[PDB]
Design an enzyme around this catalytic site. Structure first.
Site, short mmCIF file in Angstrom:
data_model
loop_
_atom_site.label_atom_id
_atom_site.label_comp_id
_atom_site.label_asym_id
_atom_site.label_seq_id
_atom_site.Cartn_x
_atom_site.Cartn_y
_atom_site.Cartn_z
N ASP A 290 0.86 -1.21 0.00
CA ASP A 290 0.00 0.00 0.00
C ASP A 290 0.87 1.22 0.00
O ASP A 290 1.79 1.34 0.80
CB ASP A 290 -0.88 -0.15 1.26
CG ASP A 290 -1.77 1.00 1.43
OD1 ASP A 290 -2.44 1.41 0.47
OD2 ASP A 290 -1.76 1.62 2.49
N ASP A 292 1.16 5.10 0.58
CA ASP A 292 0.40 6.20 1.20
C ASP A 292 1.19 7.50 1.13
O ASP A 292 1.85 7.96 2.08
CB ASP A 292 0.15 5.85 2.68
CG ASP A 292 -0.80 4.70 2.85
OD1 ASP A 292 -1.36 4.18 1.87
OD2 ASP A 292 -0.98 4.29 4.01
N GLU A 294 1.46 11.17 0.99
CA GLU A 294 0.65 12.37 1.38
C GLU A 294 1.46 13.61 1.13
O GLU A 294 2.30 14.03 1.97
CB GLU A 294 0.29 12.20 2.87
CG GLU A 294 -0.68 10.98 3.10
CD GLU A 294 -1.14 10.86 4.54
OE1 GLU A 294 -1.35 11.88 5.24
OE2 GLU A 294 -1.39 9.72 4.92
N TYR A 370 -11.55 11.45 5.77
CA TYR A 370 -11.49 11.93 7.18
C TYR A 370 -10.44 13.02 7.26
O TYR A 370 -9.80 13.35 6.24
CB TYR A 370 -11.27 10.76 8.19
CG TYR A 370 -10.21 9.77 7.74
CD1 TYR A 370 -8.86 10.18 7.59
CD2 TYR A 370 -10.58 8.49 7.39
CE1 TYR A 370 -7.83 9.29 7.18
CE2 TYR A 370 -9.57 7.59 6.90
CZ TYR A 370 -8.22 8.01 6.85
OH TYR A 370 -7.24 7.07 6.38
C1 LIG Z 1 -9.31 16.37 2.77
C2 LIG Z 1 -7.92 16.79 2.49
O1 LIG Z 1 -7.50 16.92 1.35
C3 LIG Z 1 -7.06 16.99 3.72
C4 LIG Z 1 -5.76 17.71 3.59
C5 LIG Z 1 -4.99 17.33 4.87
C6 LIG Z 1 -5.69 17.77 6.16
N1 LIG Z 1 -4.66 18.04 7.26
C7 LIG Z 1 -4.19 17.02 8.06
O2 LIG Z 1 -4.53 15.84 7.94
C8 LIG Z 1 -3.28 17.35 9.05
C9 LIG Z 1 -2.81 18.62 9.27
N2 LIG Z 1 -1.97 18.67 10.30
C10 LIG Z 1 -1.88 17.37 10.68
N3 LIG Z 1 -2.68 16.59 9.88
C11 LIG Z 1 -2.94 15.13 9.87
N4 LIG Z 1 -3.25 19.63 8.54
C12 LIG Z 1 -2.70 20.97 8.85
C13 LIG Z 1 -4.12 19.36 7.50
O3 LIG Z 1 -4.55 20.31 6.88
#
Ligand SMILES: CC(=O)CCCCn1c(=O)c2c(ncn2C)n(C)c1=O
Ligand SMILES: CC(=O)CCCCn1c(=O)c2c(ncn2C)n(C)c1=O
Length: 567
Positions: A290, A292, A294, A370
């Site tokens: 998988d 992932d 990001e 989420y």
């Molecule tokens: C729905 C979408 O495209 C989310 C973009 C990331 C959202 N996000 C986080 O997940 C996040 C975060 N800081 C820690 N985390 C886990 N920030 C600032 C964020 O925007």
């Protein structure tokens, strides 16, 4: 007529042998700690203190002769190599002219990483997790995290494995630029730097060898001379119990994605894909990979990374090259390997990759429906809503409106259905998309009633900072709380609210919340009702199934609801 040999357990390493050599008492680079061999080396010491010793010995596994050699007086060492993992009843026979005599049988363990030497794992599952007869075509996945065995105290034998089709094991790092890991802590960064000693950049490694294979779990019967311990020996024993379960290593995640941005150069993808092949050949209980990342294009932990022009094409090329490699493994092993990815679902993440092209190479996309809102800022919202909630402004759902300062929205609001619809609009087949459920809340404090623009909806208020709490209540990091903490300390047995909190539910969004008006604590999460709604939506659209993040945080209610919703 020689004397029958007697086996010397201790000079034979308690009859524990292995195809994989693992450092158990030290920590160093991955290639120093892990060495997979095609043949295990077996060395069994035996003695013949009475009578006569004879001339030659034969060693038998389940009645089949596997080694032979000369008897050396009253104590002899039989050394030989053996290629097949398992548990065998071993006899050693001593022979001369006047006959042969066999030892009593003893069990010998020859470990391999498919678990072929292991009995099915003994489970210790919370009985709130119920039994279901869900169609076996439906994905029911969850992530298990390697560090869950520390303060969270959640081990592999606690997972409700009969209610799962896919276990994603998070997370395997890639050696290279990983400054984002420092946000977890310096010991976690140091562990990665130690693991990558002597490893080429862009190769995968294990981040925490203690949790993966060194730590003895007494519930699994691990002892000193057990050749493979940790989470990984437990996942091997779990696969013996549940042979149809897919266990897949997840590479990346929020803090471990910085190397992926170097994959615009094909040489680094090639290094990586080769390393994943070597990893899957070494740890044979894994069923695929998988990815992932990001996120292609950026918007992850590292604010200075992301190439929205070139990351999508690199991602597609990586999926094509992984599938070529996995087809090689399928040809070598006769097994089926799956290729999957967890992806962002904001419009801004989905526009940066052509998923219609990448998904032709993939079995499933795990849509990260989420984390739409959270304690990183002071703006309440439903973190895992299916549809646009009552709190959104005119024109916010579709993105053509403006915010409360008059600034134009830049794209459609963050909801699970806006993301699913954008993926389907690209041409991704419904039956490869898997919709995500959260087994945790995110939350704020300081959302007091005087901050709400709509007094029946605290998602229209404003926060002063992150939810705080103890680990006893499921708050491992400010702003985040395990679902089982929300149920024990905020919902209570009637689901109506305890300890100053009241439960609420946005029936249009399909999203629960709990709000303590005294402290202004507000938490957004998934619950039985929103998870049933997600199941119904997945049924309606012909999605592949559901997955959750992360399993240690559930008390069974969320996984039970995933099954109820897909029934
Ligand atoms: C729905 C979408 O495209 C989310 C973009 C990331 C959202 N996000 C986080 O997940 C996040 C975060 N800081 C820690 N985390 C886990 N920030 C600032 C964020 O925007
Ligand atoms: C990825 C996510 O949202 C969960 C983060 C939990 C915090 N965290 C880690 O991410 C982590 C970790 N060890 C390695 N990694 C990658 N620990 C201990 C951790 O707490």
């Amino acid at each position: 007529a020689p004397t029958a040999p007697s086996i010397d357990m201790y000079g034979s390493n308690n009859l524990q042998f292995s195809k994989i050599e693992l450092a158990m008492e030290t920590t160093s680079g991955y290639n120093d700690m892990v060495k997979y061999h095609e043949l295990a080396k077996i060395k069994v010491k035996f003695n013949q203190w009475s009578g006569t010793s004879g001339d030659t010995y034969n060693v038998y596994f389940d009645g089949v002769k596997v080694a032979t050699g000369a008897i050396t007086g009253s104590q002899t060492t039989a050394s030989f190599e053996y290629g097949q993992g398992g548990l065998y009843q071993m006899e050693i026979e001593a022979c001369d002219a006047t006959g042969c005599s066999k030892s009593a049988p003893v069990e010998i363990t020859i470990a391999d990483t498919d678990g072929s030497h292991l009995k099915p794992l003994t489970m210790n599952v919370d009985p709130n997790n119920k039994s279901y007869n869900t169609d076996p075509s439906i994905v029911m996945g969850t992530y298990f995290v390697e560090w869950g065995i520390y303060g969270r105290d959640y081990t592999v034998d606690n997972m409700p494995v009969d209610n799962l089709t896919h276990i994603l094991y998070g997370f395997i790092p890639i050696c290279g630029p990983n400054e984002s890991v420092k946000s977890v802590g310096g010991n976690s960064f140091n562990a990665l730097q130690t693991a990558c000693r002597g490893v080429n950049d862009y190769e995968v490694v294990i981040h925490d060898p203690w949790a993966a294979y060194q730590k003895s779990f007494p519930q699994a019967g691990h002892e000193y001379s057990t050749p493979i311990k940790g989470n990984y020996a437990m996942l091997m024993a779990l696969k013996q119990r549940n042979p149809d379960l897919k266990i897949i290593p997840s590479i990346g995640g929020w803090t471990l994605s910085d190397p992926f941005y170097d994959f615009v150069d094909k040489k680094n993808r090639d290094t990586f894909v080769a390393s994943v092949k070597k990893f899957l050949k070494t740890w044979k209980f894994y069923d695929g990979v998988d990815i992932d990342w990001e996120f292609p294009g950026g918007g992850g932990a590292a604010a200075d990374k992301g190439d929205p022009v070139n990351d999508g094409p690199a991602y597609i090329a990586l999926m094509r090259e992984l599938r070529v490699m996995l087809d090689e493994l399928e040809a070598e092993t006769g097994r089926t390997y799956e290729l999957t990815s967890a992806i962002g679902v904001g419009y801004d993440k989905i526009e940066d990759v052509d998923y219609a092209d990448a998904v032709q190479y993939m079995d499933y996309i795990f849509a990260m429906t989420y984390d739409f809102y959270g304690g990183w800022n002071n703006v309440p919202g439903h973190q895992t809503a299916l549809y646009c909630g009552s709190f959104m402004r005119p024109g916010q759902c579709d993105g053509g409106g403006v915010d409360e300062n008059g600034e134009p929205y830049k794209g459609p609001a963050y909801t699970a259905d806006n993301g699913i619809q954008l993926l389907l609009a690209q041409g991704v087949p419904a039956n490869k998309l898997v919709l995500g459920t959260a087994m945790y809340g995110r939350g704020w404090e300081g959302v007091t009633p005087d901050t709400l623009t709509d007094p029946n909806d605290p998602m229209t208020g404003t926060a002063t900072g992150k939810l705080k709490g103890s680990t006893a209540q499921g708050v491992w990091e400010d702003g985040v709380i395990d679902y089982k903490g929300i149920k024990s300390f905020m919902l209570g047995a009637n689901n109506t609210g305890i300890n100053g909190f009241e439960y609420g539910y946005d029936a249009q969004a399909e999203a629960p919340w709990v709000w303590n008006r005294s402290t202004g604590e507000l938490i957004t999460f998934d619950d039985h009702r929103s998870v049933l709604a997600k199941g119904n939506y997945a049924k309606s659209l012909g999605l592949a199934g559901l997955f959750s993040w992360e399993i240690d945080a559930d008390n069974g209610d969320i996984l039970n609801a995933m099954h109820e919703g897909m029934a």
